[PDB]
RNA sequence: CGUAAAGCGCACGCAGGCGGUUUGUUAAGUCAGAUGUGAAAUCCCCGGGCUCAACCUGGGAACUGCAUCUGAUACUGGCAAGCUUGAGUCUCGUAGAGGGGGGUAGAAUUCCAGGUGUAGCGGUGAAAUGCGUAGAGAUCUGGAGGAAUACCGGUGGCGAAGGCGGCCCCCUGGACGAAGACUGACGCUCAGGUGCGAAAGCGUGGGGAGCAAACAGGAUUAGAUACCCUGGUAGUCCACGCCGUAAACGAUGUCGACUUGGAGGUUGUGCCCUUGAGGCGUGGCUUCCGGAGCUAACGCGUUAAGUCGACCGCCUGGGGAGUA
């Protein structure tokens, strides 16, 4: 998947601290990082239909977590999707 | 505790999960029967078995495998009781009717044999008839003087002699079996977790049973 | 996923009676302890015991009368797919009275005899026959 | 609903249905009571009158409902707060024909050029067509080209399914294991919808060694539009798009829980004289046989076709017809 240094950087940016690596913002940001990186991979190749299935699992799982965090705390939702530049 | 000196259980192979209450089960892939469970079981079997033995009943030891012979002939015949030591015929209890006339032919042919006309009229047919007495004598050996179907049944291996257990359950006869860890307590009314194929174990074992049979009211 | 833990409990007891099992453990809850208290009270199980602190574990010591098993047929009636709420007049008797039906009434989890005597119906959880 | 008709080819997922566990509040569902109403006749019950009966009739019950008010709060729902046993994230490794792109290697077939060499070669049940003194076949050397990747190779592995087999690099998906940390029900299923989906086929552009529908010849045969033989085009191969199906099959939907065993395979790992071809455990996936149980039987049998729960799909005699 993603680099150890990259995952550590995103956990450090979005968590309450390091070791808070399962929080909803953190998981969303890690999924987001990998989705964008693989935008770069699937612009090329384009017939890697197996890897894409992994990608659509990432998209769907991000969506589930955004729905959770939307119906738990909406302020965290707006700050989160504001910071990640998603939602369009 | 130790009446059962030397057997401690057997049968690594084809062990049966229904023998799980009776297994201590440690050493070298083989299963050890919990003989601290066997001793109350075997004392109960001696209790009810002596109880029917004192009511003037017939016991029918069953000993087809070797060397249960002649240990079942020795133990049954040490009492005034009955036995099967060679191949147990399929249906000598549940059609005893037809087996009654085979026993009748054994009696008529031994009476004809050692007393009557045995040298009469042929040598070849006389040899034929004598080996009919060997076949009818080793198959219908102990049971030939029974004259009823018996009041209990004592089998020495439950899986090897499943036919006799199945028939005595079919007829309402109390089955007294020494099961091993491969056997199954089918309809054995008085199960005894022991060792079926050790001659020390079955001579000790039948020694105790034949000891408690030959105490009636006396 | 687990969506009916009560039917899971009754499944544990059917398959424990069917396997000559001495005792049955499961995760515990308030409703399972209520039902289990009804079953001990009516004589279908021998005892229950809830252990653990942070993850409670209900344990039902089962009954066997003869070689046969005591709980002859336990069924789940008000499943989550379709819930069944009977009044005090519609409240059924199982095996013509020889077998209780555990109904959750507002006063608590009772039997059919006890809640028909209390004068109030409710949600019929399970038939124990 | 394995084989009788019936499990979508496989997944992702919206609306929908269902939802672990604890406490508090509400009381919508649920329950109890009350009130209003539910026309009369009819049905039912207990009586009465026609000589009886049908019939007529008195009183009740009933009209299983709806609305409102009063309560109960166990279950379900709403709301608030949690909790970790479900789900997920992070750390470290493991195995793998998982995918896509690029390169390369060795055997072999065909073709071309050349040397030797000479009368057959090939083929079949037998033959003939076919190739061959214009020198075939055999054999050696050099070259070109395309496709596939022996041995390993294994009821072995990976993948949702279709499927994926030289070796190397690059990009990339998933699974599993060990200890610990974190989030805290974030879950399950899924009509419409969307995606992937062997082979054949279609479109455009390449490629084309072998194999080979069509086709042609030779046989066989009563005939032979076949099986067999000799050739042989599309196709098979590549790029991009379409199609959208298969005995797409474990003829077995997905997810979760429980219920005796045995022998293996494969991939993790801990412990303990290792003092072997060690011992003892604990996971993941998988093969064979079998117990209870189930099953019309056959068989399935902890990877269920057993015992349950959630949601979906489908069936309703054969044909006509999966056709118009």
Q: What are the sequence ranges of the domains in chain C?
A: 5-69, 74-128
d(CA A85, CA A32): 10
DSSP assignment of chain A, as one string?
Answer: ---HHHHHHHHHHHSSSTT--SSHHHHHHHHHHHHHHHHHHHHS----HHHHHHHHHHHHHHHHHHHHHHTT-HHHHHHHHHHH----
Interatomic CA–C1' length for residue A49 and nucleotide D213, angstroms:
32
**What is the CATH class of C5-69?**
alpha beta
d(CA B65, CA B202): 11
Instruction: Report which residue is nearest nucleotide D173 when distances run from CA to C1'.
Output: A51
Maximum distance among all Cα pairs of chain A, rounded to whole angstroms: 40
Interatomic CA–C1' length for residue A45 and nucleotide D166, angstroms:
24
Q: What is the CA radius of gyration of chain C?
A: 14
Instruction: Report which residue is nearest nucleotide D64 when distances run from CA to C1'.
Output: C90
d(CA A49, CA B116): 98
**Positions of chain D reached by protein Cβ under 7 A:** 11-14, 17-23, 29-33, 71-76, 83-92, 98-101, 159-162, 171-174, 181-188, 195-197, 240-241, 255-262, 280, 291-293, 306-311
Residue B14's nearest nucleotide, by CA–C1', is: D262
d(CA A69, CA A31): 15
- The alpha carbon dihedral of C4, C5, C10, C14 has a sign of positive
- The alpha carbon dihedral of B162, B163, B166, B167 has a sign of negative
d(CA B91, CA A35): 78
What is the CATH code for C74-128?
Answer: 3.30.1490.10
Interatomic CA–C1' length for residue A85 and nucleotide D221, angstroms:
81
SS3 B8: coil
Q: Which helix (H) or strand (E) holds C38?
A: helix C30-42
Residue A50's nearest nucleotide, by CA–C1', is: D99
Interatomic CA–C1' length for residue B144 and nucleotide D314, angstroms:
68
Name the experiment that determined this structure: cryo-EM
Interatomic CA–C1' length for residue A43 and nucleotide D174, angstroms:
21
Instruction: Report which residue is nearest nucleotide D196 when distances run from CA to C1'.
Output: A49
Specified resolution (Å): 4.0
Peptide bond into B70 cis (omega under 30): yes
B138 Cβ contact partners less than 8 Å away, ≥ 6 residues apart: B85, B86
Question: How do strand C23-27 and strand B175-179 relate by DSSP bridges?
Answer: unpaired
Those chains having 3 or more beta-carbon pairs within 8 angstroms of chain C are none
C-beta of residue A1 within 8 angstroms of C-beta of residue A27: no
Kindly state the DSSP code that residue B69 receives in the 8-state scheme: T
Residues in chain B whose C lies over 2.5 Å from the next residue's N (breaks after): none
Strands laid side by side in the B175-179 sheet: B83-84, B61-62, B153-155, B175-179, B190-193
- What is the number of alpha carbons within 13 Å of residue B171 lying toward its C-beta? 21
**Closest-CA residue to B156 (of B203, B109, B121, B118):** B203
SS3 B154: strand
C12 Cβ contact partners less than 8 Å away, ≥ 6 residues apart: C24, C26, C60
Question: How do strand B61-62 and strand B153-155 relate by DSSP bridges?
Answer: parallel
Other Cβ atoms within 10 Å of B88 Cβ, number: 20
Residue A69's nearest nucleotide, by CA–C1', is: D186
| Residue B101: alpha-carbon gap to chain centroid | 22
SS3 B155: strand
H-state helical runs in chain B: 35-53, 71-78, 96-114, 124-139, 162-171, 199-213
Q: Decide if C5-69 and C74-128 have a common fold.
A: no
First to last CA, chain A: 25
d(CA B162, CA B160): 6
C-beta of residue A79 within 8 angstroms of C-beta of residue A70: no
Residue C55's nearest nucleotide, by CA–C1', is: D85
**Closest-CA residue to B38 (of B205, B207, B216, B212):** B205
Q: Which helix (H) or strand (E) holds B62?
A: strand B61-62
Interatomic CA–C1' length for residue B189 and nucleotide D135, angstroms:
98
DSSP assignment of B185-217, as one string?
Answer: -SS-SEEEE--SS-HHHHHHHHHHHHHHHT-S-
Maximum distance among all Cα pairs of chain B, rounded to whole angstroms: 66
Interatomic CA–C1' length for residue A4 and nucleotide D137, angstroms:
68
């Amino acid at each position: 998947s993603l680099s150890t240094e990259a995952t550590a950087k995103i956990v450090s940016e979005f968590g309450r601290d390091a070791n808070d690596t399962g929080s909803t913002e953190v998981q969303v940001a890690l999924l987001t990082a990998q989705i964008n990186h693989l935008q770069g991979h699937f612009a090329e190749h384009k017939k890697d239909h197996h890897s894409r299935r992994g990608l659509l699992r990432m998209v769907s799982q991000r969506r589930k977590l955004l729905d959770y965090l939307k119906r738990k705390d909406v302020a965290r939702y707006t700050q989160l999707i504001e910071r990640l530049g998603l939602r369009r | 505790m130790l009446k059962a000196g030397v057997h401690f259980g057997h049968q690594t192979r084809y062990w049966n999960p229904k023998m799980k209450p009776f297994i201590f089960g440690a050493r070298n892939k083989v299963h050890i029967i919990n003989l601290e469970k066997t001793v109350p079981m075997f004392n109960e079997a001696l209790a009810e078995l002596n109880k029917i033995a004192s009511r003037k009943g017939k016991i029918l030891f069953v000993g087809t495998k070797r060397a249960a012979s002649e240990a079942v002939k020795d133990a049954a015949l040490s009492c005034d009781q009955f036995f099967v030591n060679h191949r147990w015929l399929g249906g000598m209890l549940t059609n005893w009717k037809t087996v009654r006339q085979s026993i009748k032919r054994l009696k008529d042919l031994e009476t004809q044999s050692q007393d009557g006309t045995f040298d009469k009229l042929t040598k070849k047919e006389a040899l034929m008839r004598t080996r009919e007495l060997e076949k009818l004598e080793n198959s219908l050996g102990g049971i030939k003087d029974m004259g009823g179907l018996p009041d209990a049944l004592f089998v020495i291996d439950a899986d090897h002699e499943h036919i006799a257990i199945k028939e005595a359950n079919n007829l309402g006869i109390p089955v007294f079996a020494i099961v091993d860890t491969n056997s199954d307590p089918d309809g054995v009314d008085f199960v005894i977790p022991g060792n079926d194929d050790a001659i020390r174990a079955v001579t000790l074992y039948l020694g105790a049973v034949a000891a408690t049979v030959r105490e009636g009211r006396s | 996923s687990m969506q009916d833990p009560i039917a899971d409990m009754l499944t544990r007891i059917r398959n424990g009676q069917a396997a000559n099992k001495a005792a049955v453990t499961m995760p515990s809850s308030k409703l399972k302890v209520a039902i289990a208290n009804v079953l001990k009270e009516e004589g279908f199980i021998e005892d229950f015991k809830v252990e653990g602190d942070t993850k409670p574990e209900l344990e039902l010591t089962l009954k066997y009368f003869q070689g046969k098993a005591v709980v002859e047929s336990i069924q789940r009636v008000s499943r989550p797919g379709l819930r069944i709420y009977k009044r005090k007049d519609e409240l059924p008797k199982v095996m013509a009275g020889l077998g209780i039906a555990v109904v959750s009434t507002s006063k608590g989890v009772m039997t059919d005899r006890a809640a028909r005597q209390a004068g109030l119906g409710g949600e019929i959880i399970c038939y124990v026959a």
